[PDB]
Paper text:
Human manganese superoxide dismutase (MnSOD) is a mitochondrial matrix metalloenzyme that catalyzes the dismutation of reactive superoxide radicals, generated as byproducts of mitochondrial respiration, into molecular oxygen (O2) and hydrogen peroxide (H2O2). As the only known mitochondrial enzyme capable of converting reactive radicals into diffusible products that can be further metabolized or exported, MnSOD serves as the critical first line of defence against oxidative stress. In the wild-type enzyme, Gln143 mediates proton transfers with the manganese-bound solvent (WAT1) to drive redox cycling of the metal, which is necessary for effective superoxide dismutation. Substitution with Asn stalls catalysis because the increased distance from WAT1 disrupts critical proton-coupled electron-transfer (PCET) events, and the redox cycling of the active-site metal is impaired.
Substituting Gln143 with Asn preserves the active-site architecture, but the hole created disrupts proton transfers with the WAT1 solvent. The alternate Tyr34 conformation and the presence of the Wcav solvent introduce new hydrogen bonds within the active site of Gln143Asn MnSOD, which are not observed in the wild-type enzyme. We note that the resting-state electrostatic solvent-accessible surface of Gln143Asn MnSOD is different from the surface of resting-state wild-type MnSOD. The active-site funnel of the wild type is much more positively charged than that of the Gln143Asn mutant. This is because the wild-type resting state contains Mn3+ and the Gln143Asn resting state contains Mn2+. Gln143Asn MnSOD retains the more neutral surface most of the time, and this seems to help stabilize the H2O2-binding sites. To monitor changes in the oxidation state and coordination geometry of the catalytic manganese in the Gln143Asn variant upon H2O2 treatment, we compared the Mn K-edge high-energy-resonance fluorescence-detected X-ray absorption near-edge spectra (HERFD-XANES) of the purified enzyme before and after H2O2 treatment, following established protocols. We observe no detectable shift in either rising-edge or pre-edge features, indicating no alteration in the redox state or coordination geometry of the catalytic manganese after H2O2 treatment in Gln143Asn MnSOD.
Numbering used by the authors:
A (entry chain A): 0 to 197
B (entry chain B): 0 to 198
The structure:
């Protein structure tokens, strides 16, 4: 009945040298912890305002709900999208879909990189599934706005481009972080999410 | 719970010739009614989502909640802000505050007119009360975003500048609508809302 912080499925240092253990520990144990806690606080406030029919209070809570709820949604997916066992290319129908919809795996990587580099301020780049069209789709989201809740696309792979996702290690050079992160993408998890859509 | 469409404080033609009866009837019986109906549907969907801990669903419902919920909030205030016995100027402490914060009643009208005419697309112009600062403040809101829920200001007087608020009568000439509406402002209601902000 309450949202909880999922354990990281690997050690804080498991993604070194691509994302260092200081980032992983802060990102999970400080940043995500705060979203979950503030999400639960906001949800309780929203339950009270709903039961009273206080629409002003409901609307005033929307920023916190989207930001912290989106934070919890996005980071929960993000941790499973990475793995010490990741890197390389997907296989099977996910790879065939990537080649069909984006031309090639490398072309897909440069489109998702571009979407991720192009976020001005805080946000996320996403590979999603468009269930209406039955094909893959790339989108960028601001701050912690979550993909499915704001666009209807089913999330397959997210890349956090908030500065806390990379700054300690890569400083201002966001492209260096994006170069590195391809080495730890958990294509097994992205594949499972894709198959679940179809 | 279940929100309801409030009765109008007067009949649909009571604000003529400034806002014609066809507009008032559509505005209350069709537009506000739809906000209530869609607000109730959206609240029930949010109750289901909360019980499931479905945060995606909660967030997907926010546009409909803000739009219809804000529509309900704003129009409920709007109807009480107008009156067949309105027009003229406020008195007492509200008039004192208007002179103090905007210089004069006429300069206040200019500023609220300008904010309302300046909305690009659908929206509202508002005179509000800033509780933190203890003075009056003019703001504009897009679409049906409600004043207090999005800015913290307490609404005193709102002017709907959605096209459905004036188009049938004034067509594209929103400034003529703004000039006419001053004739039906219920300063008694605005005063009540102001006094409530500070006792
Ligand atoms: K590196
Ligand atoms: K006339
Ligand atoms: K009058
Ligand atoms: Mn993050
Ligand atoms: Mn309206």
């Amino acid at each position: 009945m309450k949202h909880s912080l999922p354990d990281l499925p690997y050690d804080y240092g498991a993604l070194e040298p691509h994302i260092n253990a200081q980032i992983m520990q802060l990102h999970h144990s400080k940043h995500h912890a705060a979203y979950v806690n503030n999400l639960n606080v906001t949800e309780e406030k929203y339950q009270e305002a709903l039961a009273k029919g206080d629409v002003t209070a409901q609307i005033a809570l929307q920023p916190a709900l989207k930001f912290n709820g989106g934070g919890h949604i996005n980071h929960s997916i993000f941790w499973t999208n990475l793995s010490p066992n990741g890197g390389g290319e997907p296989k099977g129908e996910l790879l065939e879909a990537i080649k069909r919809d984006f031309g090639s795996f490398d072309k897909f990587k440069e489109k998702l990189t571009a979407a991720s580099v192009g976020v001005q301020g805080s946000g996320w780049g996403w590979l999603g599934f468009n269930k209406e069209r039955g094909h893959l789709q790339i989108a960028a989201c601001p701050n912690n706005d979550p993909l499915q809740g704001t666009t209807g696309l089913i999330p397959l792979l997210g890349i956090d481009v908030w500065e806390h996702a990379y700054y300690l290690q890569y400083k201002n050079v966001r492209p260096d972080y994006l170069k590195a992160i391809w080495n730890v993408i958990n294509w097994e998890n992205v594949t499972e999410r894709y198959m679940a859509c179809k």
